[PDB]
Amino acid sequence: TRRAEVAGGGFAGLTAAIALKQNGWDVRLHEKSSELRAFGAGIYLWHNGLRVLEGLGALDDVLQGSHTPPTYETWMHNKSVSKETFNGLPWRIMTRSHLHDALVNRARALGVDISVNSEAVAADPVGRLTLQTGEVLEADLIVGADGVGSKVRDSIGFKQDRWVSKDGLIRLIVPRMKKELGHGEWDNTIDMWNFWPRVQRILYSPCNENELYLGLMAPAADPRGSSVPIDLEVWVEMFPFLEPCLIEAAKLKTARYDKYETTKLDSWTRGKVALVGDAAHAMCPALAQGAGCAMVNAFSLSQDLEEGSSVEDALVAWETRIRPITDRCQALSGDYAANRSLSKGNMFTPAALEAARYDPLRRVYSWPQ
Ligand SMILES: Cc1cc2nc3c(=O)[nH]c(=O)nc-3n(C[C@H](O)[C@H](O)[C@H](O)COP(=O)(O)OP(=O)(O)OC[C@H]3O[C@@H](n4cnc5c(N)ncnc54)[C@H](O)[C@@H]3O)c2cc1C
């Protein structure tokens, strides 16, 4: 029986833990925080993430209580400029807690040993993980799924470029208020852009009958539109049709203006250590693939560990096989974010949807456009 030690209890670490435990690994997972929780309010998944959830035995619990809008709509200056449905490609909006709780419930059902208040502070490619307590754990595989600030990565030393933006956005869950919104297509995703009379955008993202995910985006140089708790007037002025939801948003004193952040590395492996998720490839969120690529890569790691090879060799084959999809998606996401490409509408082209089209279970691209 092969042993894996996983650092990080986010989507990458929980996916790796479940996938490895289903293949007969003895897996233990270490989360630094004192509780198992996910920040960020809401999240989109696409076919590729949903197929990972199927492969993990967690798809049902995610689809119950989450939403596929009838269309992904874009507005520019309150005019609908596109409505896209991706020729049937599956996608889904949910709260972060919904996704994260479905994964924890599945890891617990399978008997993955999960520890909280358990931080990985150093790792050794020969298969050792040191916790903040000074416990040294030996394993046949070490998974660094410890986020953009991964200590598994930085204790070993990987050549990298890391960037944190000055700009960011405010992501919140509020009640749907659907009756109070009155006439409209309030089950849709609506990406509501404006450059005039100021730069303000809301991505409107229903999660289910009760819960609405809003992303309120304004530049950090705008002291009102970047304020938390939200400056209700500046948001109601440019999105008056969402006033019932904005009034609920303005009650949230836990709101944060979170910044964008990216990582790109020379490599994702060293000996028996694999870096998965934002530890390796954090990206701009324009294509809503950061967690999709983290989950595809974590599940794909598990697949390459079933080939009969040494763990070291399986890790090299895994990066070689799967990294190009993530490098392309990171680059394209970044290009769309810098160019504000989504503001044009009709930008979920075949190329943009390549990562979402990938099926990690069959290892082919599906849902042709
Ligand atoms: C504004 C924004 C919008 C986004 N929207 C989407 C979207 O709609 N769809 C999508 O797919 N992606 C989205 N993403 C990307 C997604 O949030 C991340 O890519 C994904 O959460 C990364 O998962 P992860 O498990 O690698 O890291 P994380 O989710 O960061 O989890 C790492 C976990 O490790 C713990 N940890 C950290 N260090 C240690 C350590 N040393 N030891 C032990 N535990 C540790 C942390 O506490 C945390 O629980 C978005 C990101 C941003 C910034």
Domain ranges of the chain: 1-38+96-165+261-369, 39-95+166-260
Look at the alpha carbons of 172, 178, 184, 189 in this order and tell me if their dihedral is positive or negative: positive
Task: Among 35, 43, 100, 130, say which to mutate for ligand 1: greatest number of ligand atoms within 8 Å of CB.
Answer: 43
Which of left, alpha, beta for 363 (phi over 0: left; psi -120 to 50: alpha)? left
Say if CB 162 and CB 148 are below 8 A apart. Answer: yes
Pairing status of strand 42-46 against strand 91-95: antiparallel
The residues, any chain, with a CB within 8 Å of residue 352's CB and separated by 6 or more, are 287, 332, 336
* Token pair for 261: 């952040």
Pairing status of strand 258-265 against strand 79-84: unpaired
| Alpha carbons 158 and 129: distance in angstroms, whole number | 16
SS3 131: strand
Compute, in angstroms, the gap from residue 47 CA to the centroid of ligand 1.
19
CATH class, domain 1-38+96-165+261-369, is alpha beta
Integer distance in angstroms from the first to the last C-alpha of the chain? 43
CATH architecture of structural domain 39-95+166-260: 2-Layer Sandwich (3.30)
| 8-state DSSP, 343 | G
Which of left, alpha, beta for 77 (phi over 0: left; psi -120 to 50: alpha)? left
189 burial (CB, 10 Å; 0-12 / 13-18 / 19+) is buried
Residue 11 CB less than 6 A away from ligand 1 = yes
* Token pair for 160: 């990298």
Residue 10 CB less than 6 A away from ligand 1 = yes
Q: Whose CA is nearest to atom 7 of ligand 1?
A: 288
Q: Say what the resolution is, in angstroms.
A: 1.5
* Token pair for 71: 């269309």
Ligand 1 atom nearest the C-alpha of 118 is 43
SS3 1: coil
Which of left, alpha, beta for 366 (phi over 0: left; psi -120 to 50: alpha)? beta
Give 30's strand partners: 7, 115
